[PDB]
Every structure is written in C-alpha cells, then in structure tokens.
Symmetry: none
Subunit: 407 residues, 2 copies
C-alpha cells in the first residue's frame, strides 16, 4: 500500500515511512481526510485526496471523511451537504455496515460545544506562537496579504480534530493535500502530547501541469464540478482528454489504477503515436466512468469521436449532442442572415475573417457534419440539420464549432 | 473632572481630551477599570486607578471595577484532576474579598452613579470557541499583534504560547461587552496598560461602530527612582489587614520621603490645591515634624482600615516611644507594632531577668553591656525607667498578659512575648 503510493509518486511528505508501513501490515488502519462542506459539490481539487482514500480502502483499511463544519460556521446546512455529496463520495469509497466501511464524520460533534476557555486552556497551551509562525505557508501569508488571528487559529482546531478522531475511532493516519502539511503534523504532535499516542501523517501532491497552470480549472477558470448539472459529463471527459502529452502518464498513474506495465505500454503510445491520444482517451474514460458511470461515459465517447470525424454523429441523441455542442462556441442562426458556409464559419468563430474562411475552405480543411465542403458558396439544406437544430462545423481534425437553428 | 485630573497631574496618556470633555458635560459617563491580581487582595499598586475611579464618582459619574476572572481561569496549566473541584468557587471567593475592599473606595448603592463590580466570566464563561474565533478573532491582524512591542520583545527566544498571545483579544472584548451591557464609554488603567486598553477602544469601533475613550493614570515612582508600593526589601503592601497589618500600612506611608509626600498627597487624597500648598510649606519649613506624611498615613489608613484602626495605630506609635499610655492599646495593634521590630520569645523556664531579655531581644549585645546601659539613661520596661539590675518581670507587668515593651534610648525598641 505504501509501496503502491510510492511507485506512483503519490507520497509528497510523511511521518516515518517505515514506522507507518509497520502500522499498515499490523492491521486495518482508519485513515481520514478533511473537507470544507460550504461548497455545493466536490470538484477536481478533491480528486487526489478522495482517490487516495479509495486506494487505502482497497488495500484493506478504513477511510473517514471529516466534514469541517466548525470552520464552515466560523469561516467567512452541514447535514444537507452530506446528502448533496454522498452520491459523489460513494463513487470513491464504500459505505457498508462492517469493519472497513466508509464513514462521514462532522467535527462540529466536538468543536460545537467547545468553550473559548477550554480552547485557550487545554488546546492553546500546547502551542508556541513562534513554531506556528515558523512556517513558509504562514510566513508567505504574513509577507503577502496578511493573516487574521482567526485564520491563524484554524491550525489548533484542525489539530484537535485529529485527537478527537483518534479517541473516537482509533484513527491513526491522516491524509491531505501537500499544502495542508502543517495542519496535519500539528495534529500528530497534539495527539502525542494530549494522549501519549503515536500517529501518522501523509500528504499527496497538488496537481499542476507542466505549463504551470493549476489542475481542475475549467474554461472560465472556475471549478470542474463532479456534479453533472454543474459540469456536464462531456465537459468532464473533454477536460481530461485534452491533457497535455507532457502530463498524461503522470496523471494516469496518479488518478487511475492502471498497473506500471499498463502505464509502460501507454507511455510508448504517447512516444510513438502522439496524435492518436491513446493515453488521453484512457485517462478520460477512467475518470468519467469513476464519477459519472459507464452508460454516461459511453455516450460521451461516441459524441466525442463523432464530433471529430471519428464517428457517426447522426446516431447521437439530441441530449448528448446538445450538451457536447454547448461546451464549444455556437453560432445561433436565425431567419436571414448568414446561411452560407463562409458566413457560418466566421459567425461560429471558426474563421476570423471572411477571407480566412475562403482560404481554409479551398484547402479542403472545412467540413459540415463530417462531410467535406469544396464549394465556397455552399448553403445549408433543410435535411442537413441534426434533430432539426444542429450543424457541426470543423476545421482540420481538431477545431470544431456549432450552428443552432432558431425561430 | 478632566481639570481635576489635569492639575493633580493624573493623565499619563489619553484619547482626545476635547471629545472626552464633551461627553463628560453631556452627563454621567460609565467609566471602568480592570484588575486581575495574583493573590485575592489588592495592593498599593492599585491605589491610583482606584482612587481615580473614586474621583469620577465624586464628579458625578458611574465607576465599574471589572474583575478579570477569565485570565486566571485560563492561566493554570493544572488539569481536571485537580482544576475542577475548586475552580469556580475560588474565583467567586476572590471576587468578594476584592469587592469588600472596593467598598472603601467607591460607593455601592442603587442609584445611577452606583458602583458595579462585575466579573468578566459573566460573558467569557459561556463564550464558545466558535463565537470567539468568528465574532472577535476576525477583527485582529496577526501581523499587527506581533508588532505591539510588549509582545514584540516577549516573542524573542522560546517566545509565547497561543494562549498568552490571545489575552489581548479577550481584554479588548471586555470593553465591547461592557459598552453593550452598561453603555460604558471610558476605560482607565495604569500607564503600562495603555496598549491593550486602546485595543478595546479600537475593537469597540470595528464591532459596535461607537467611538469610546481611554485614559491612563501614572505609574508611581519615588523621586529616588525606586518603585512605589514595595516592602523595605521584598514585595507588596496588601489592603488586607491579616496580610499587611494596619500598622505596617500606616508606617509605610508615614515614611514617605519628603521629596514625594506632596505629590502622593495630591494623587492619593482629596485635599485642595491650597491645603496641599499649606503642607508643602510645612514640609519645607518643619521637615522634622512630618505633618505631610502623618496626614498621608492618616488619610490612607482611614480609607482602607477605617477611623478606629487608624486611631489605634497612631496611639500605639505614640505610646511605644513614651509619648502616651500603652495600657490603653488594642492587643491586635500592639502585636503588629512589636512584630515589625525584633521580638524575643520568652518560653517557660528560660531566664527572666531584665539583663537576659535585653540580650534576648537584641537591644544589648552583652550581659555586661546591658548592665551598663541600664544606669543613668536607662532601659525602660513598658515606659517605666528601670534602675535595678536584678529586676525581674512581675506577672502584672505583661501587657494583655503577653507583651513587654523594652526600649533603650528613645528610638530603639524590642518586644518580649511569653509562650
């Protein structure tokens, strides 16, 4: 288990690895990871922690998801969050009535009834201002935009959480994002002091692409939401299928369960057959199946291939095609007005100039509905529209835009 | 009132005086001062803020003494084993003892100007970690708190616990809470306390939008540079009689240097500018007579221990050096009086003779040197010139059947206490 995470490169930081491995084989651990419940859904940023809990469960350990209700209430519906999220959480970890079964806790269970005086006396006395400050995270925030005394205290609440989870569920490892380290180790120390017991920390890296951009950002720079109504399965698939070649294997070994040999063979694919995207499409299906299931993934794949001349877009059902198209720019054609391939290309944002359109058309690079267009004056026939609503324009084999009929 | 304080020289630092003056005329302010002592008693160190509170009342305003109960309840690293059984009862004992003393300085009665003594546990006790961090903690910059130089200097080396770093927020909060509950509009303290008093002023504006005020009072230093309110060698002078006898209280103030006596009279008492002028001349002209110091001692012993105990302490210190009759003295006073000097304990069997007692009590170094000093000039036993050498103490000589007052010249005295 620590061997798995290690070959995959998933262990950013940790307490003693040998002492931890020792605890692992000893018997089924209870691992936990924290979550802010103010959010209406889990997004792409929760994937590594969540996936890493899944990894621990497979290896036979028990995962706990700790809802940070305390902070949500201080910070700047916590029963509601759970059931809003439970559909998603279940995709990663298993909730059964047995020993390794998953389990959502809420740190309000203890923090909610914690007085200011207990906090300051029984927790705060074990903490040195210097040590707390003595951190690049807080030191950056101190040098940067400043930190409030409340923001500075979170560490203590977070530490207490570990003590309280160890007491209540025999919990002995906390996992988190690489940036959450201080929070976690604080908890290990507190547990040592308040309880005499020895426990562990292990962080996983933040994912950031070779080009420097941060993982899980959408088109508008928002979040990639696990929730289908917020981020469509298509938007979800699309995202991972457009992973750079630089990153695709790393992402695969970090996010999926492919064996090192399977990853060897895909590594070759990216080397020898890069325009074919074997690695991207595999990554895309694995992460889309994970979150949105197989049936939903199947549609998206067909749609995705159809849209790029690799398929049959007549056989895609309106719901699917519509969703697919609404992720690209779409020119909404009405009575009048374009009604011509040249016009449509510029309107849909596929060609900049009407001049540019003409050019690419005469290079054979333009296709409507996967059929090529030679003629500069081409006009859309009535029977061309898919489901009476849609045209699919494409330049080369990579860039597509839509056209929506309107009344 | 601001003029009263102004000429007496009692404004160490303040927020704008004009604005504060404005509010004073507008009518009765509620002024507060806080105390969070070690022991369960005030000492000389508290006099100035407290007597200053008294001035506010005399000037028509309402004083509040805020017992800072929260800090002590947080301060002990002791654990529930041992914290619990006692915690809340000793806090309630600490407040009543202090409230008893407070009644000397400030008049409690139902009335608008009626003093209130509160304990900041009436809000902090039920304050939750979440409320704390949410409602109060958000208004503080860590950067700003680190800058504050009490903290800046104390944060060098091992530095400080999260708890010690937090007290500021709770201190500040007391101001907010007291403005909510009593429309409290000014806090006063010692000069050193400015830092966290303004912390409160500030927090009251942020949280509550109101502009409130701050006025500190001077820390008292002798003209010779020494700190006020410390024992000859050691520590505090307590307001509690069974920690510091009334005699010791009187004598502390009777020994105020000439250099300080008028200033202290000016800060600790209600004498007029003219009355002070009179005593100032008195001190310059007749320094030996100690008029100023005796007034100080008298004024401050009455304030704390009442007229009767002051009456006793004056009679005792007169009778003890011949000038008055020690048959009249309260045993309690006489005991204190002799316990300041060097007292020789006469157990049963040990020698009685006047010469033995002289050597026992430190008044003479030898059995002969004693025999010597007895002759023309004399030792006195209970203001009685002893002229025989083999003089033994009769049973009826012992004052309250316990004490002999031995005196060598007219200045050095010692006590004999039969066990």
């Amino acid at each position: 288990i620590l061997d798995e995470l290690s070959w995959r490169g998933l262990i950013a930081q940790s307490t003693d690895l040998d002492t931890l491995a020792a605890e692992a084989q000893r018997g089924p651990m209870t691992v936990y990871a924290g979550f802010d419940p103010t959010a209406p859904s889990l997004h792409a940023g929760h994937l590594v922690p969540l996936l890493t809990l899944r990894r621990f469960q497979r290896a036979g350990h028990r995962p706990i998801v700790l809802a940070g209700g305390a902070t949500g209430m201080i910070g700047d519906t916590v029963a509601e969050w759970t059931e809003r999220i439970r559909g998603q959480l279940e995709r990663f970890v298993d909730f059964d009535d047995s020993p390794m079964g998953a389990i959502v806790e809420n740190n309000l269970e203890w923090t909610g009834s914690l007085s200011a005086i207990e906090f300051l006396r029984d927790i705060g006395k074990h903490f040195s201002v210097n040590v707390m400050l003595a951190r690049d995270t807080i030191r950056r925030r101190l040098a940067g935009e400043g930190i409030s005394y409340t923001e500075f205290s979170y560490l203590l609440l977070q530490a207490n959480d570990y003590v309280e989870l160890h007491r209540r569920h025999g919990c002995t490892l906390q996992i988190g994002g690489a940036d959450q380290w201080g929070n976690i180790i604080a908890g290990v120390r507190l547990v040592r002091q308040k309880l005499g017991a020895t426990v562990h920390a292990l962080t996983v890296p933040l994912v950031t692409a070779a080009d420097g951009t941060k993982f899980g950002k959408s088109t508008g720079g928002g979040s990639l939401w696990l929730d289908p109504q917020m981020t469509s399965p298509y938007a979800w698939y699309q995202y991972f299928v457009n992973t750079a070649d630089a990153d695709v294997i790393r992402y695969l070994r970090w996010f999926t369960f492919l064996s090192a040999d399977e990853l060897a063979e895909l590594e070759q694919a990216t080397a020898q057959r890069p325009q074919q995207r074997a690695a991207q499409r595999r990554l895309a299906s694995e992460l889309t199946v994970l979150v949105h299931g197989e049936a939903a993934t199947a549609a998206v794949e067909h749609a995705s291939r159809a849209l790029f001349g690799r398929g049959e877009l007549a056989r895609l059902d309106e719901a699917t095609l519509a969703a697919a198209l609404r992720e690209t720019t779409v020119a909404e054609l009405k009575p009048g007005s374009p009604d011509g391939i040249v016009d449509l290309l510029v309107a849909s944002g596929l060609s900049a100039s009407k001049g540019a359109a003409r050019r690419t058309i005469h290079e054979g690079g333009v296709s409507v509905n996967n059929i090529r267009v030679d003629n500069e004056e081409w006009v859309p026939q009535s029977s061309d529209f898919l489901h009476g609503r849609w045209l699919v324009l494409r330049r080369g084999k990579r860039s597509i835009a839509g056209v929506e009929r309107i009344g």
